[PDB]
Design an enzyme around this catalytic site. Structure first.
Site, PDB file in Angstrom:
ATOM      1  N   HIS A 252       0.771  -1.264   0.000  1.00 25.51           N
ATOM      2  CA  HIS A 252       0.000   0.000   0.000  1.00 25.51           C
ATOM      3  C   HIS A 252       0.791   1.298   0.000  1.00 25.51           C
ATOM      4  O   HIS A 252       0.416   2.246  -0.702  1.00 25.51           O
ATOM      5  CB  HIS A 252      -1.069   0.011   1.110  1.00 25.51           C
ATOM      6  CG  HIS A 252      -2.173  -0.982   0.893  1.00 25.51           C
ATOM      7  ND1 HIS A 252      -2.116  -2.275   1.360  1.00 25.51           N
ATOM      8  CD2 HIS A 252      -3.355  -0.872   0.242  1.00 25.51           C
ATOM      9  CE1 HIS A 252      -3.214  -2.918   1.006  1.00 25.51           C
ATOM     10  NE2 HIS A 252      -3.978  -2.091   0.318  1.00 25.51           N
ATOM     11  N   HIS A 349      -6.382  -2.728   8.349  1.00 25.51           N
ATOM     12  CA  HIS A 349      -6.105  -2.460   6.943  1.00 25.51           C
ATOM     13  C   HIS A 349      -5.629  -1.023   6.716  1.00 25.51           C
ATOM     14  O   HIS A 349      -6.306  -0.231   6.045  1.00 25.51           O
ATOM     15  CB  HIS A 349      -7.350  -2.729   6.116  1.00 25.51           C
ATOM     16  CG  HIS A 349      -7.080  -2.918   4.660  1.00 25.51           C
ATOM     17  ND1 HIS A 349      -7.156  -4.156   4.052  1.00 25.51           N
ATOM     18  CD2 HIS A 349      -6.736  -2.040   3.689  1.00 25.51           C
ATOM     19  CE1 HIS A 349      -6.869  -4.030   2.767  1.00 25.51           C
ATOM     20  NE2 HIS A 349      -6.618  -2.754   2.521  1.00 25.51           N
ATOM     21  N   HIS A 429      -8.791   6.062   1.454  1.00 26.55           N
ATOM     22  CA  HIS A 429      -7.393   5.933   1.082  1.00 26.55           C
ATOM     23  C   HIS A 429      -6.683   7.278   1.081  1.00 26.55           C
ATOM     24  O   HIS A 429      -7.316   8.330   1.235  1.00 26.55           O
ATOM     25  CB  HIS A 429      -7.301   5.293  -0.302  1.00 26.55           C
ATOM     26  CG  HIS A 429      -7.799   3.885  -0.333  1.00 26.55           C
ATOM     27  ND1 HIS A 429      -9.114   3.564  -0.088  1.00 26.55           N
ATOM     28  CD2 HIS A 429      -7.160   2.710  -0.555  1.00 26.55           C
ATOM     29  CE1 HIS A 429      -9.268   2.253  -0.171  1.00 26.55           C
ATOM     30  NE2 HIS A 429      -8.098   1.711  -0.454  1.00 26.55           N
TER      31      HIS A 429
END
Ligand SMILES: [Cl-]
Ligand SMILES: [Cl-]
Ligand SMILES: [Cl-]
Ligand SMILES: [Cl-]
Ligand SMILES: [Cl-]
Ligand SMILES: [Cl-]
Ligand SMILES: [Cl-]
Ligand SMILES: [Cl-]
Ligand SMILES: [Cl-]
Ligand SMILES: [Cl-]
Ligand SMILES: [Cl-]
Ligand SMILES: [Cl-]
Ligand SMILES: [Cl-]
EC number: 2.8.2.22
Lengths: 564, 566, 566
Positions: A252, A349, A429
């Site tokens: 990520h 996450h 995000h």
């Protein structure tokens, strides 16, 4: 006797195509011991509307490459390139014809629409024709996920049973890495073989190439699996580090700080839980590493945040086959890359990192919990999230929403506010710090207000920006875009935004548009939106080469900065 | 200038230690363009009772190595070596002092007793002092099993759940490979790094190094994980082949045939079950491959034998397959797919652990640990089975061999294989079902689950060396030799192990690989034996002790220097 | 199931020997998720006079290794190790027995005396028993130099002729890297395979491992061939960088600066000479690189110094640079390009062998073996030269430092550097021109070609440790310390070697790397010394003897456990 080297092309040395072997749409003019300065390169546009690529090259680059780096070529083409310099006090120039070969996708099967990902230019406003975008996307391999970490067997497990898996080794896919211009043409390609080999079973060359971010040198960091890297636009691999032995599964994000360190998002291997079971944790540890790959610091989020908060977890789309269905959490979910609470499951996450040089802290985006600032001291400084599920002592760190006069906005525990455009972010995000000092987030919008809507098509994504007062503990929504674009603008996963001060635009990439349209390519939509007027200045769609295949991110790249 | 090469040692070239970098107790006398013949090497014994190692070297080896191969050196020692040859019609001789370095164990932790495996000579009869034994053993890695194959998710699995594992990728351990003489001295060592790297995650260098078997050229084949190999005694890796793409998890055996092919024991990756689930099967496929690594034939045993027969499967010790040791295996209907005791493709229903090629009828003989011993033809039909009759259905039931005595009259045995008024017994969880030079069938009868049950008390177990005579036309079997029955639990190897008839001195060679495996905290004993075939006298007994507790050995080979350098 | 990981040793995790696989005399106590501080490790001495090794471990190291690093173990030994820490406010302690394996030399042939290099303790004064020394030495490979860079054919060469070689690729040898204590015991070993493989022909793993220097983090940089590296004392390879594409043949030195950059000594590949011929230059380019491997700066010495000055070049021993030893070097106009004594780019005209960074003026100080010692600025201008005046032309002649005594009055020396009525002498074929903690310039003055001639008889040679004080504004140099002049040829290192002032105990550390190099058939002596700065008393003297005859050592370092694990 032998075979001689390529002879000089013009007034310097030879022009070598793809000098490092990882970037077929680059070339290098060998210096051949010439002492030059004031170097400028221009790659001329192809055809009538072709985009010109032009940039300076500084001394370190000349010295590092032992030549002039040529970036921005077209594939399979007689590129026309002009190199200008100063030598012995005189102005100099060469024109070269630089023939290139083809771009190859090494990962094709019966799902392939064609070999490459197709582009569609929708809008290019005047003054934005020069823009380049690096697209960080991926393509499915024939065999799919073939490897798992081995975990510790459960005492509740059957006597005869083989041991379980743990962690996230299956999070593995071929890269598809390119730069596109405003004519939809590919102007750069990173050979898939640079970092990845999907056919071999060397875990050193497996993983999911992510977190491509510019460095202060105009190079880029990236992570794939169990390694992190640095590379430049000539396709030179500058660093390649194994993760420190206690950590696994880097995904990520990677970002170089001003202090010569790099922030990584990993999991902890052989993590001993309070119940004594060892697991590889999922996306819930931050490393700070130096350029020797040593650990400067670590933030263990399982001790900092709350792995037990299922407020957002219980409200998520199970498809993000079981698409649409709200996630029903189970107490007996086996440890692994699965939705669930506690260390060993995907409770957090974390998918982005931002370094705040002003107080030596990190801002994180937890897809499944919200956005948090954590200090060097390992204390939570603030949380931006709906208040439901948060307990003391973390509850008191929640930011209180306010309007432009500073007066409280009223919202329920699910983050639905009254008489206000203000909204929190959900499964978001890229929670980064813009050049203005504000917080910019891509608010994907799954599980919005901690519930699934009546109809799937009611979901939407936003580019959102906030102004935070850390002293007062108040957050203000100062900008948004995309709520009124509907289902064709909804990216359930991935995606990015970033404020551009040079032209006062918000840049964005929605990476998963139409993900759920079974049998259709997934749309990755690049946008530049005028910050003031909200007019679309750029819109370009990238279509996946197999159906239902998400893109991750894109970056706005600038040739002026590439060759320091 | 540069650095010159080593100068000549004597009347030929330099003497290079460990030319290929895999075998530190070898050296090579460089030929330096000399034309020679009738090469003989002698490595002299160390000290007073030291064993001499002596052998001829043929032209192919001289040409292949561009030198004279020196095998049998002691570690960390000024070895005394004599090489004799003929050149220009004249008899020639050189004496060399070949210094060597140390043997290194690269895999040590708090479980380590010390770095190397200790030896203990128990018996060496006159005329057996020259014998050398290659021990195929292993040593735990610090991390243990760290990787799994990814499988196909079950439709009955949780919606949120990550996918399951499949296959046998955790069957992975560092190797410990040496030759021992009758003084208990290490006379050869295969660098662990030759084939294995337990610290890196290149699966190409992971697995369980196994099935080391001599080839017609005096070299050896072997398997580790997803690759098969050929190497020689100079440490040269002669072949390294990936398994064909359909197959995975190669363990237990590799054997070259007279036909230039090699037989391997593998599992099928992406095997589609009748219910449509894909699994990597376990230890139930035989490949015949050529030296190009291509598949000449395959035997899918899931379609040839019976994966549902649990007669022996339910009778096994849970601790074998620590402590759930002593406890009988209780099979479950919902045992997840993987390297687990159970029925059906996807579970460890056969655990085939040896292969033998019968050149007389182009057939293969297999040892299935969990089912018995079987001959299967080129035509993929079962020719005969040696096993207790329980659990076998028709058509396979009719292939079971019928026990008979030396006069050929039936022996009465129950369905569990317990016979009346007879020395005859079947084999149970057995290994190495091979064809002796006499044409008989020799088996190491480990004896776990003997007579399809666990005994009253745990130590009521024993192993046997056993040999049979089979009449294939009549479908009858006669037990013609046995040993070990009276030696009790101190001679009981629950797992691994091997026997092999040696015609040269009329002995039965054996290696019990797992003696005292369950002795918590004690090293495991690997017992090399040679038993006089006629008198049953122990001619050789040597014990190898593991370097960590409760750590099994696999096999050993009786190796012969006269054959190593064709 | 699988194989479990090593179980915990005591109150933390397992103790793993050689976690990274490069350092067999290290181990790691796995943290197993424990939160600890104030870590101290003690490795106890072996036997009665054995040296104890003790040190703290900082948080960065604990986090980096996910454990407690254990450094200083003896080979092949049940080491006694004590680890102390604080956890949950409580003082904690564990005692471990850490068994280790052997040290292996992978490069042995008929020249080998034995496998390891022998040590001989000569002197250890009270208060210096704890000292540890890392020896950077090497061992010949069986094949010697086997590869060359291909060069550009000469227009004066034969028409039919194959092309010539260029550069210095034959400068290639196996490493032999250890730490020795004051009992002469090996307490650390760097696996030869870490960076080198002399049997394979991957040029990425060839070269001459050199320039091992501590970094600000307590780790070490190093160069070998076409790569530079960083490693730590647990054997972890922290950086591996290819040289930038313009450059080749990195030898002799690597040093990290305060600015996060690393200075290297390289040659330029494809260097275009004024006559248009392309060559790989020799030991005459300095790179400054960042941790991305990128070039921050370069100093092309062929354009900065004088490649035509043969004052020292013509005065050198042919045997150094066996037996053409003793004979003075006769330069030739037609010496082919390559690693050969001669003038001009393409030949070994400078042989630069050390680098030092002067952070005070952002400059570099270099030792040119064949020219002298020079300071060059960031601006690429020569700031000063320390050398005999012969052969220097203007403008460089004006940069030569002027010798003066303690009162600052001129010393009279001839053009060959022979001074009158004075202890002052220049340095000749010197090494390690570094900046001491006092700010002075320390040099190992090897002394081949002393006073620009070979002496009357070969043994009339000597080396010195020497220190100077430089006044850069006045352009004057004062010799303020020396040693070794009176110790004669038995203290003479024709090549390699190093000194370094140690402020902690006011000694001058030194290592003479090539004592008795020319003694045909005898090992070469590497002599570690610590000389009391004030009294000139020998506080430490230890001899390392090469494992093959006539095989030089390169350098040694005084290493400090207290700094190894930040
Ligand atoms: Cl055109
Ligand atoms: Cl073309
Ligand atoms: Cl051109
Ligand atoms: Cl000899
Ligand atoms: Cl031993
Ligand atoms: Cl065999
Ligand atoms: Cl089934
Ligand atoms: Cl018997
Ligand atoms: Cl212990
Ligand atoms: Cl020794
Ligand atoms: Cl240093
Ligand atoms: Cl010249
Ligand atoms: Cl003196």
């Amino acid at each position: 006797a032998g075979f001689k080297p390529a002879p000089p092309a013009g007034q310097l040395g030879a022009v070598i195509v793809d000098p490092y072997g990882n970037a077929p749409l680059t070339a290098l003019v060998d210096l051949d011991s010439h002492v030059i300065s004031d170097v400028k390169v221009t790659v001329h546009g192809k055809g009538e509307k072709g985009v010109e690529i032009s940039y300076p090259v500084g001394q370190e680059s000349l010295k590092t490459y032992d030549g002039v780096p040529i970036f921005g070529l077209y594939q399979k083409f007689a590129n026309k390139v002009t190199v200008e310099w100063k030598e012995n006090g005189k102005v100099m120039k060469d024109d070269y014809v630089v023939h290139t070969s083809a771009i190859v996708n090494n990962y094709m099967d019966n799902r392939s629409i064609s070999d490459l990902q197709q582009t569609k230019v929708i809008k290019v406003a005047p003054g934005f024709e020069d823009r380049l975008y690096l697209v960080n996307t991926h393509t499915f391999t024939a065999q799919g996920s073939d490897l798992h970490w081995h975990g510790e067997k459960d005492k509740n497990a059957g006597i005869l049973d083989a041991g379980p898996a743990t962690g996230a080794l299956p999070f593995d896919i071929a890269p598809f890495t390119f730069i596109v211009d405003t004519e939809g043409e590919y102007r750069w390609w990173l050979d898939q073989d640079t970092f990845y080999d999907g056919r071999d079973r060397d875990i050193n060359k497996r993983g999911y190439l992510m977190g491509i971010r510019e460095t202060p040198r105009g190079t880029f960091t990236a992570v794939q699996g169990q390694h992190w890297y640095e590379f430049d636009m000539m396709g030179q691999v500058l660093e390649d580090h194994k993760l420190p032995r206690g950590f696994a599964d880097a995904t990520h994000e990677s970002i170089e700080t001003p202090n010569g360190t790099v922030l990584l998002r990993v999991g902890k291997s052989n993590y001993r839980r309070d119940d004594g079971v060892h697991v590889t944790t999922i996306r819930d540890h931050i490393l700070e590493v130096d350029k020797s790959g040593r650990v400067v610091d670590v933030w263990d989020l399982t001790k900092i945040l709350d792995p037990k908060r299922d407020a957002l977890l219980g409200a998520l789309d199970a498809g993000a086959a079981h698409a649409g269905q709200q996630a029903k959490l189970e107490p007996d979910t086996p440890f692994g890359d699965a939705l669930g609470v506690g260390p060993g499951r995907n409770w957090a996450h974390v998918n982005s990192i931002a370094y705040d040089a002003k107080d030596d802290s990190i801002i994180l985006s937890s897809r499944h919990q919200g956005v948090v600032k954590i200090g060097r001291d390992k204390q939570v400084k603030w949380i931006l999230a709906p208040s439901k599920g948060w307990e003391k002592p973390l509850a008191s760190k929640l930011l209180k929403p306010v309007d432009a006069n500073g007066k409280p906005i009223t919202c329920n525990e699910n983050g639905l506010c009254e008489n206000s455009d203000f909204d929190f972010t959900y499964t978001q995000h890229t929670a980064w710090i813009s050049s203005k000092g504000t917080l910019t987030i891509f608010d994907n919008g799954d599980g919005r207000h901690l519930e699934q809507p009546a109809l799937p098509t009611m979901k939407y994504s936003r580019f959102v920006e906030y102004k935070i007062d850390e002293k007062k503990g108040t957050v203000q929504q100062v900008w948004e875009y995309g709520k009124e674009r509907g289902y064709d603008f909804y990216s359930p996963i991935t995606s990015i935004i970033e404020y551009q001060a040079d032209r006062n635009t918000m840049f964005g990439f929605g990476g998963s548009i139409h993900l759920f349209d079974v049998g259709q390519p997934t749309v990755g939509k690049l946008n530049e939106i005028d910050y003031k007027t909200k007019e679309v200045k750029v819109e370009i769609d990238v279509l996946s080469d197999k159906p239902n295949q998400t893109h991750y991110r894109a970056l706005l790249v600038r040739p002026q900065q590439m060759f320091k």
